[PDB]
Write an enzyme that holds these catalytic residues in place. Structure first.
Site, PDB file in Angstrom:
ATOM      1  N   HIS A 127     -34.408  -1.184 -37.153  1.00 32.24           N
ATOM      2  CA  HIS A 127     -33.579  -0.333 -36.267  1.00 32.24           C
ATOM      3  C   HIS A 127     -33.288   1.011 -36.927  1.00 32.24           C
ATOM      4  O   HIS A 127     -33.466   2.045 -36.266  1.00 32.24           O
ATOM      5  CB  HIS A 127     -32.269  -0.978 -35.831  1.00 32.24           C
ATOM      6  CG  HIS A 127     -31.705  -0.161 -34.726  1.00 32.24           C
ATOM      7  ND1 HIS A 127     -32.199  -0.242 -33.463  1.00 32.24           N
ATOM      8  CD2 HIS A 127     -30.855   0.873 -34.733  1.00 32.24           C
ATOM      9  CE1 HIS A 127     -31.605   0.636 -32.707  1.00 32.24           C
ATOM     10  NE2 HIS A 127     -30.790   1.329 -33.458  1.00 32.24           N
ATOM     11  N   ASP A 139     -34.314   4.673 -35.379  1.00 32.49           N
ATOM     12  CA  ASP A 139     -33.392   5.838 -35.303  1.00 32.49           C
ATOM     13  C   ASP A 139     -34.074   7.055 -35.955  1.00 32.49           C
ATOM     14  O   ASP A 139     -33.997   8.182 -35.406  1.00 32.49           O
ATOM     15  CB  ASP A 139     -32.023   5.541 -35.939  1.00 32.49           C
ATOM     16  CG  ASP A 139     -31.056   4.649 -35.153  1.00 32.49           C
ATOM     17  OD1 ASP A 139     -31.232   4.423 -33.934  1.00 32.49           O
ATOM     18  OD2 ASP A 139     -30.130   4.162 -35.772  1.00 32.49           O
ATOM     19  N   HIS A 176     -32.964   6.509 -29.268  1.00 33.71           N
ATOM     20  CA  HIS A 176     -33.784   5.330 -28.884  1.00 33.71           C
ATOM     21  C   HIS A 176     -34.866   5.740 -27.881  1.00 33.71           C
ATOM     22  O   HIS A 176     -36.051   5.355 -28.100  1.00 33.71           O
ATOM     23  CB  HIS A 176     -32.936   4.149 -28.390  1.00 33.71           C
ATOM     24  CG  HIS A 176     -31.951   3.662 -29.392  1.00 33.71           C
ATOM     25  ND1 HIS A 176     -31.004   2.715 -29.082  1.00 33.71           N
ATOM     26  CD2 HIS A 176     -31.685   4.060 -30.656  1.00 33.71           C
ATOM     27  CE1 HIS A 176     -30.217   2.540 -30.125  1.00 33.71           C
ATOM     28  NE2 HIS A 176     -30.620   3.324 -31.105  1.00 33.71           N
ATOM     29  N   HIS A 193     -28.521   9.975 -38.933  1.00 32.40           N
ATOM     30  CA  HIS A 193     -28.789  11.038 -37.935  1.00 32.40           C
ATOM     31  C   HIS A 193     -28.603  12.392 -38.616  1.00 32.40           C
ATOM     32  O   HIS A 193     -29.492  13.227 -38.464  1.00 32.40           O
ATOM     33  CB  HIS A 193     -27.927  10.838 -36.679  1.00 32.40           C
ATOM     34  CG  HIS A 193     -28.085   9.480 -36.091  1.00 32.40           C
ATOM     35  ND1 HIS A 193     -29.261   9.082 -35.449  1.00 32.40           N
ATOM     36  CD2 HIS A 193     -27.256   8.409 -36.077  1.00 32.40           C
ATOM     37  CE1 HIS A 193     -29.123   7.847 -35.014  1.00 32.40           C
ATOM     38  NE2 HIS A 193     -27.908   7.411 -35.393  1.00 32.40           N
TER      39      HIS A 193
HETATM   40  C1  LIG Z   1     -22.397   0.208 -39.498  1.00 30.23           C
HETATM   41  C2  LIG Z   1     -22.554   1.517 -38.749  1.00 30.23           C
HETATM   42  C3  LIG Z   1     -21.479   2.498 -39.194  1.00 30.23           C
HETATM   43  C4  LIG Z   1     -23.943   2.084 -38.995  1.00 30.23           C
HETATM   44  O1  LIG Z   1     -24.205   2.662 -40.037  1.00 30.23           O
HETATM   45  N1  LIG Z   1     -24.898   1.926 -38.056  1.00 30.23           N
HETATM   46  C5  LIG Z   1     -26.254   2.489 -38.110  1.00 30.23           C
HETATM   47  C6  LIG Z   1     -26.892   2.092 -36.791  1.00 30.23           C
HETATM   48  N2  LIG Z   1     -26.871   3.158 -35.803  1.00 30.23           N
HETATM   49  C7  LIG Z   1     -27.602   3.188 -34.672  1.00 30.23           C
HETATM   50  O2  LIG Z   1     -28.241   2.235 -34.213  1.00 30.23           O
HETATM   51  C8  LIG Z   1     -27.551   4.525 -33.948  1.00 30.23           C
HETATM   52  C9  LIG Z   1     -26.172   4.796 -33.342  1.00 30.23           C
HETATM   53  C10 LIG Z   1     -26.227   4.171 -31.973  1.00 30.23           C
HETATM   54  F1  LIG Z   1     -25.925   2.826 -32.098  1.00 30.23           F
HETATM   55  C11 LIG Z   1     -27.635   4.308 -31.542  1.00 30.23           C
HETATM   56  N3  LIG Z   1     -28.397   4.593 -32.775  1.00 30.23           N
HETATM   57  C12 LIG Z   1     -26.105   0.851 -36.369  1.00 30.23           C
HETATM   58  C13 LIG Z   1     -24.684   1.113 -36.864  1.00 30.23           C
HETATM   59  C14 LIG Z   1     -23.850   1.813 -35.802  1.00 30.23           C
HETATM   60  O3  LIG Z   1     -23.413   2.946 -35.953  1.00 30.23           O
HETATM   61  N4  LIG Z   1     -23.654   1.080 -34.720  1.00 30.23           N
HETATM   62  C15 LIG Z   1     -22.923   1.554 -33.584  1.00 30.23           C
HETATM   63  C16 LIG Z   1     -22.270   0.422 -32.833  1.00 30.23           C
HETATM   64  C17 LIG Z   1     -21.025  -0.060 -33.200  1.00 30.23           C
HETATM   65  C18 LIG Z   1     -20.446  -1.100 -32.487  1.00 30.23           C
HETATM   66  C19 LIG Z   1     -21.107  -1.697 -31.412  1.00 30.23           C
HETATM   67  C20 LIG Z   1     -20.445  -2.727 -30.676  1.00 30.23           C
HETATM   68  C21 LIG Z   1     -20.020  -3.538 -30.041  1.00 30.23           C
HETATM   69  C22 LIG Z   1     -19.475  -4.632 -29.286  1.00 30.23           C
HETATM   70  C23 LIG Z   1     -20.161  -5.798 -28.960  1.00 30.23           C
HETATM   71  C24 LIG Z   1     -19.550  -6.780 -28.175  1.00 30.23           C
HETATM   72  C25 LIG Z   1     -18.272  -6.600 -27.671  1.00 30.23           C
HETATM   73  C26 LIG Z   1     -17.594  -5.437 -27.949  1.00 30.23           C
HETATM   74  C27 LIG Z   1     -18.196  -4.458 -28.732  1.00 30.23           C
HETATM   75  C28 LIG Z   1     -22.322  -1.183 -31.045  1.00 30.23           C
HETATM   76  C29 LIG Z   1     -22.898  -0.159 -31.753  1.00 30.23           C
HETATM   77 ZN   LIG Z   2     -29.993   3.218 -33.052  1.00 37.70          ZN
END
Ligand SMILES: CC(C)C(=O)N1C[C@H](NC(=O)[C@@H]2C[C@H](F)CN2)C[C@@H]1C(=O)NCc1ccc(C#Cc2ccccc2)cc1
Ligand SMILES: [Zn+2]
Length: 299
Positions: A237, A241, A78, A264
């Protein structure tokens, strides 16, 4: 055309998405030919991680920088996307923890922080990577490719099968510019499935996750009270990334990036594949800013 850094030193604090740990981030002016240097200061003496495509690991659901002995700084994509955004070539990024703070889940707070520090132009020529051949990498049904093109274009397709992420905008395409990045991409937040939080927290991931830094989606919908900043925030988003990932080489790229379901790992595998082919790319500087693509006019 000229290399860039900051006028002054700025600080922000936050928490690490993965560690839950409080963090202070310090951005620092750096002279010509320094490049992008990450630095851990919780360690004494402090450890430097120059941004390089061979130094990436892809294992912790984000982009990590690592040295030869796997000491690391996590979740750089980010802030890195913000540096790509505003063309910044030379800077020192200090964290007193193993991870960049997540702030609001997007690149926008990094953009504000860098604009408050002001951009300083230098009397040395900014180097661009110009793609001079098609390169393509694959992983299952996933693929990513670069092609020669006299600007910077990104074409990203996601495929999430999920009612809260309507098919109608699981694809996004832009011609890059600081203003476009800032208006269209920079505010797109990270997201996560409520179904995944138990598993990920049991493994020490997403310990700093909150409704403040992420879009949370259950089996049916977005739970955040205020919903989305864009109908297609999810694919914007993913493209944020991808921009962060491609800047791991520390230079803006002149080329056409196209990807289907990339992340990534595949984005780094592409970036590496390009730089391993001598004949697929070339540095280029700009004597006069007439030959410089519109993609890289200053903001
Ligand atoms: C579906 C998932 C496998 C996927 O394919 N991607 C792709 C995107 N990745 C990014 O945005 C990357 C990884 C990093 F987030 C920064 N850049 C977005 C999601 C991902 O990994 N999210 C990471 C992620 C997972 C969970 C919570 C919670 C939370 C939460 C919220 C409230 C209370 C308690 C917990 C945040 C975040
Ligand atoms: Zn991200």
């Amino acid at each position: 055309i000229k290399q860039r850094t900051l006028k002054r030193i700025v600080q922000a604090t936050g928490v690490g998405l993965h560690t839950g740990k409080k963090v202070t981030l310090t951005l620092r002016p750096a002279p010509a030919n320094t490049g992008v240097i990450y630095r851990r200061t919780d360690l004494n003496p402090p450890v430097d991680f120059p941004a390089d495509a061979k130094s990436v690991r892809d294992t912790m659901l984000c982009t990590c920088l690592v040295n030869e002995h796997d000491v690391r700084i996590s979740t750089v994509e980010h802030l890195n996307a913000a540096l790509a955004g505003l063309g910044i070539d030379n800077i020192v990024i200090e964290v007193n923890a193993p991870e960049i703070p997540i702030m609001d889940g997007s690149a926008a707070p990094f953009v504000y922080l860098l604009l408050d520090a002001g951009i300083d132009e230098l009397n040395c020529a900014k180097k661009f990577v110009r793609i001079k051949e098609t390169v393509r990498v694959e992983d299952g049904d996933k693929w990513a490719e670069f092609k020669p093109y006299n600007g910077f274009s990104l074409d990203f397709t996601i495929d999430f099968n999920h009612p809260a992420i309507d098919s109608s905008n699981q694809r996004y395409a832009m011609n890059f510019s600081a203003d476009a990045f800032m208006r269209q991409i920079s505010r797109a937040r990270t997201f996560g499935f409520m179904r995944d939080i138990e598993y990920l927290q049991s493994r020490g991931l997403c310990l700093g996750g909150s409704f403040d830094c992420a879009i949370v989606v259950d089996d049916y919908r977005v739970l955040n009270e205020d919903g989305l900043r864009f109908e297609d925030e999810f694919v914007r988003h993913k493209m944020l990334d991808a921009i962060g990932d491609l800047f791991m080489c520390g230079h803006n790229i002149i080329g056409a990036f196209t990807a289907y379901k990339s992340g990534h790992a595949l984005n780094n595998k592409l970036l590496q594949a390009v730089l391993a082919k001598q004949e697929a790319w070339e540095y280029v500087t700009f004597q006069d800013d007439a030959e410089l693509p519109l993609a890289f006019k200053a903001p």
